Write a protein that binds this ligand. Structure first.
Ligand SMILES: [Ca+2]
Ligand SMILES: [Ca+2]
Ligand SMILES: [Ca+2]
Length: 215
């Protein structure tokens, strides 16, 4: 059977509601006198009443701003009986996909990671891996994040003893001169702006790390 073309709607619509879309209707009204209704979540079920369908005509409409993070796609189903309450057309399916929008800053799991790194270690050594997550869609720039170190402290010897794999997020050293008696531990702030690190559309957020130099 031919399948009904999916309506794609982005969350956080700005109304006014009800918004207009498709007009699902049966060609029986060519002599008959139909009447419609919808079913399934958003219709006659939780959120009950988000998708309404003008009994007559068939305009299919949505009554509120949506959010992909609660329900991404809707599997509604339209029906049609004639005024003598028969049943002329088998219920047809309808899919309302909800498209992603970057409306979720990235969280960092632990807001305070900890770790160590040996005494005076050769550069490029691996110290620890911090990570973050983003509720927005993963195969999307709204869910693709990148990490960077905003600050280090103490500021000596070199005010940049570490680095962090912009993609995977594991701290690495690039400078030498680590001495647990000259500096027992470091405190770094870690940012993780999303949108593929994009600075003017990515939503940032932070967490910090304490690197304990091993003796
Ligand atoms: Ca949301
Ligand atoms: Ca985001
Ligand atoms: Ca989202």
């Amino acid at each position: 059977d031919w399948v009904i073309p999916p309506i794609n709607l982005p969350e956080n619509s700005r109304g006014p509601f009800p918004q207009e879309l498709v007009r699902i209707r049966s060609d029986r009204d060519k002599n008959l006198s139909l009447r419609y209704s919808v079913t399934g979540p958003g219709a006659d079920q939780p959120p009950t009443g988000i998708f309404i369908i003008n009994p007559i005509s068939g305009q299919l409409s949505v009554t509120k701003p949506l959010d992909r993070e609660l329900i991404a796609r809707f599997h509604l189903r339209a029906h049609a009986v004639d005024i003598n309450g028969n049943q002329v057309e088998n219920p047809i399916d309808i899919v309302i996909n909800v498209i992603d929008m970057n409306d979720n800053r990235p969280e960092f799991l632990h807001q305070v990671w900890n770790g160590s790194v040996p005494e005076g270690s050769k550069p490029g050594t691996y110290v620890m891996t911090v990570t973050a997550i983003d509720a927005d869609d993963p195969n999307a720039l709204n869910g693709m994040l990148r990490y960077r170190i905003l600050s280090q402290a103490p500021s000596t010897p070199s005010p940049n003893m570490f680095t962090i794999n912009n993609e995977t997020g594991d701290i690495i050293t690039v400078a030498a001169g680590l001495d647990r008696e000259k500096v027992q531990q470091y405190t770094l702030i870690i940012q993780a702006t999303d949108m593929e690190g994009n600075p003017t559309y990515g939503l940032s957020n932070t967490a910090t790390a304490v690197i304990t130099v091993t003796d």
